[PDB]
Amino acid sequence: GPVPSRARVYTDVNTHRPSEYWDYESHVVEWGNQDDYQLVRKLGRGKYSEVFEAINITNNEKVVVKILKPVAAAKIKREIKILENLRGGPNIITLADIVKDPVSRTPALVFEHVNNTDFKQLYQTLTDYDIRFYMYEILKALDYCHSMGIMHRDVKPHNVMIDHEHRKLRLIDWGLAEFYHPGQEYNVRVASRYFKGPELLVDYQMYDYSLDMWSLGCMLASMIFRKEPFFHGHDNYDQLVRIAKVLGTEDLYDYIDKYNIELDPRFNDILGRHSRKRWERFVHSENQHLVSPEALDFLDKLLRYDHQSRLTAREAMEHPYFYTVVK
Ligand SMILES: Nc1ncnc2c1ncn2[C@@H]1O[C@H](COP(=O)(O)OP(=O)(O)OP(=O)(O)O)[C@@H](O)[C@H]1O
Ligand SMILES: Cc1ccc(O)c(-c2ccc(C[NH3+])cc2Cl)c1
C-alpha cells in the first residue's frame, strides 16, 4: 500500500498542546447577541454561506457577517475552533463574535471588516515590489497557522483580502482548514481545481501543511507570468496533465514511486511523456517586469511534486526573492 508521510516541520504541535486545543467536537461555543449587529448589504453568497456587510451598533464599527448554510455540525465547530486558536496571529482574519442568526437559525460568524481592493485591479496593477511585499505577508499568515498545527487547504486569491490603500492583508475563509495530526488520512476533495497539489490529484491522503505551499506557488506563477490560472486543467485529471507539461513526467513517476502510489489507470491514455520546462520559457515582453532570477528560483522551490521537498513557509521567508522587501 502507500508509504506513510509526516510533515518535516510542526509534526508535534497538536500533541504538546492540550486536547481542548484541537478537539473541535468538544468545544462549547460562547454565543454573542445577534441584536448587536445590523445587516447593511449582501456582499456575496458562497457554497457554504451568505456574507453581509454589517454594523456593530455597540461601537458603530463596520463588520462582516458570514451566515453559515446548514451543513454537518462538525464542519462548523472546526472553523470556529481554528478561528479562535488563530485569533491575533499575523494577517489572520479576526473572528470578533459568533451569534445565532434569527432567520437561518444557524451560526453567523462576525469578522473584522477589510476594505478589499478589486481582484482585477490588484492582479493587473501590483508591481514586482508589491508582489514580493504581499507574498511575504501571506507567508507570515501561513507560517503562523502551520506553527499552530493548522493547514488552510484553500489558499487562492479569493481567500486573500487586500486593502491596498493601507497595505493590509488578511487570510480568510478557514472553512476547509484542518488540524494537522501525523499519520492522519485527509479528504483529498479540498482547494479549488487550479490550486490543487499533486498529492490531491494522485489521491495521496497523508498530506500536510506543504499543500498550502503548492497553492501559494500556483498564485505566484499566475501573477508573475500573467497566465491566469497557471495550470489550467479542464477537470481534476487534465489538471495533473497540465502540471506534467511544465514539471515533466519523470519527476511525477519518481514521486508516485517513492510514496508507492498507483496512478488511476485513466492517466495511461492522457498523461503522455513530458520533459521539465525551464522557468525562463514562460518569460515574455508582457511579464518580464514581474520576473527575476530570484522569483524563478523561489517558484522552482514551491512547485515540486514531492510535498516533502517544497520550501516550508519559514524557509520561504529567508529566500533572496524577499531581500528587497522593507522589513
Ligand atoms: N472580513 C471580511 N471583510 C470583507 N469582505 C469579506 C470578509 N470576509 C469575507 N468577505 C467577502 O465574502 C466572500 C466569501 O467569503 P467566504 O469565502 O468566507 O465564504 P464562502 O462560503 O467560502 O463563499 P465563496 O463560495 O464565495 O468562497 C469573500 O470572497 C469576500 O469577498
Ligand atoms: C502577492 C500576490 C500574488 C498573487 C495574487 O493573486 C495575489 C492576490 C491576492 C488577493 C487578491 C484579492 N482577492 C488579488 C490578488 Cl492579485 C497576491
Numbering used by the authors: 3 to 329
Tell me, in the authors' exact words, what the paper reports.
CK2 is a serine/threonine kinase that is a key regulator of many cellular processes and is involved in cellular proliferation and anti-apoptotic mechanisms. In vivo it exists mainly as a holoenzyme composed of two catalytic (α and/or α′) and a dimer of regulatory (β) subunits, but it can also be found as the isolated subunits. Unlike most other kinases it is constitutively active and more than 300 proteins have been identified as CK2 substrates, making it probably one of the most pleiotropic proteins in eukaryotic systems. Hence, CK2 has been recognised as a highly promising target for anti-cancer therapies.
A number of mono- and di-substituted rings and bicyclic systems were investigated. The compounds tested so far were not able to effectively inhibit the protein activity as ATP was not displaced. Indeed, most of the co-crystal structures featured a molecule of ATP/ADP in the ATP binding site as well as the ligands bound in the αD pocket.
